[PDB]
């Protein structure tokens, strides 16, 4: 069954000889399993999808159920239009029936296929849910100890469940999320790195929304487990764990407080110096949404020694990380006490702030000018605006602020002149 032509597959499948159909279907599976350019469109245009879908229901020929399930899985892994052709052929209810198959390799293929269909977008995700996929999927995980399940089997179930949690506009149905969450929490405590990664991705999707969505996750008590996974050595685990933590601190201050209470701030010395750029960027973004909170939360950032790390990323990092650092500083100076803002200057924030006014990015200039104003406002309540003016001048910041009076964007130049007439005049 190696390297048949599509025409040969068609004559086999049209033969109405079940065994001839099995061999042609396996031939199609092997075509669709090759690395270089699987002929997905040729298979579709040959009209084979409804035949494959019909084969999913031949319970007394389990080999042709498996071969057609595999074939349809790989078609559904193509373009949106190729996934649509699988759905258009009636595959969703047929694959859901296959979840009850006594053959583990067959139900696994059905899990995989539905994951591909749900992974196309929110419409097919919700259609898979409407056909009732969740109950049979969760039933496959109703065992006392996940460790007794096959590793590949468990990984495929976790990945498909995460695709049912994925996408916005709209987010998944509330009652579907509530139904899935207890099983997700259990997978989040499993000891397989790939299960953990996909579990964290699912939690990161569920927390990417309004505070009500975040609350649903937070009240399951997963935040301490997320913080532990924040410290993992596997980058495929840290990345979604950090994204989930970052999403949660976009919620309320009380939701942010649970992240702090769980000990997340102690991981950020590593995260803010992490060699992977996106980790540094996402860690600094998370910090910016913590320095936007209450003064007692800003104080936790101070107590954990994280201000020097913010000075560090501002001083040298990828520019997108530096922009998140600028936001973190403006949020800090906006909501912080005078004492906290003083500490920021004592840690050396002024010079790397001034250097970033050189940047070809209009909004980071806006962000930095805001922070300078907030620091000056704290300096006036101390009568120490002259000392700050000297500092800003000594490091070349005044030269840059006055150059930005010449700036194209409107409130860049207005803000830069207000600074100079109020503090440097």
């Amino acid at each position: 069954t190696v390297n048949w032509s599509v025409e040969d597959i068609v004559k086999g499948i049209n033969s109405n000889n079940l065994e001839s159909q099995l061999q042609a279907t396996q031939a199609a599976r092997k075509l669709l399993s090759r690395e270089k350019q699987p002929p997905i469109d040729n298979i579709i245009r040959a009209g084979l999808i409804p035949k494959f879908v019909s084969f999913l229901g031949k319970t007394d020929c389990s080999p042709i159920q498996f071969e057609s399930a595999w074939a349809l899985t790989n078609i559904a892994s193509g373009t949106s239009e190729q996934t649509k052709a699988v759905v258009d052929g009636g595959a969703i209810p047929a694959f859901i029936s296959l979840l009850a198959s006594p053959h583990a390799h067959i139900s696994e293929q059905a899990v995989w296929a539905l994951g591909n269909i749900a992974g196309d977008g929110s419409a097919f995700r919700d259609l898979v849910i409407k056909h009732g996929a969740i109950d049979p999927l969760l039933a496959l995980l109703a065992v006392p100890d996940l460790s007794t399940l096959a590793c590949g089997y468990l990984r495929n179930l976790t990945w498909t469940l995460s695709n049912l949690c994925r996408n916005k506009n709209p987010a998944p149905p509330l009652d579907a999320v509530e139904q899935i969450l207890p099983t997700l929490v259990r997978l989040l405590h499993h000891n397989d790195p790939e299960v953990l990664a996909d579990s964290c991705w699912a939690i990161s999707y569920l927390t990417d929304g309004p505070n009500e969505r975040i609350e649903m996750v937070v009240k399951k008590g997963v935040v301490p487990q997320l913080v532990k996974l924040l410290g993992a050595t596997e980058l495929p685990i840290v990345t979604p764990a950090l994204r989930a933590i970052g999403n949660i601190v976009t919620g309320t201050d009380e939701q942010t407080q649970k992240v702090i209470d769980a000990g997340a701030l102690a991981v950020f010395p590593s995260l803010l110096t992490n060699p992977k750029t996106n980790i540094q960027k996402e860690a600094t973004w998370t910090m910016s949404n913590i320095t936007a909170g209450r003064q007692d939360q800003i104080q936790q950032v101070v107590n954990h020694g994280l201000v020097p790390f913010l000075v560090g990323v501002l001083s040298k990092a990828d520019f997108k990380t530096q922009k998140e650092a600028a936001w973190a500083i403006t949020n800090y100076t906006s909501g912080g006490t005078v004492e906290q803002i003083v500490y920021l200057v004592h840690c050396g924030i002024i010079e790397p702030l001034m250097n970033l006014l050189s940047a070809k990015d209009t909004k980071i200039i806006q962000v930095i000018l805001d922070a300078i104003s907030n620091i000056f406002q704290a300096a006036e309540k101390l009568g120490e605006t002259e000392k700050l003016s000297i500092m800003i001048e000594e490091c070349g910041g005044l030269d840059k602020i006055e150059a930005l009076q010449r700036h194209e964007n409107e409130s860049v130049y207005k803000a830069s002149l207000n600074l100079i007439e109020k503090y440097f005049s």
Binding site: R34, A76, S77, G78, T83, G115, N116, G119, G121, W159
Partner: peptide, 8 residues
Amino acid sequence: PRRVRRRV
């Protein structure tokens, strides 16, 4: 963006 996996 879509999240799909081909079985090789």
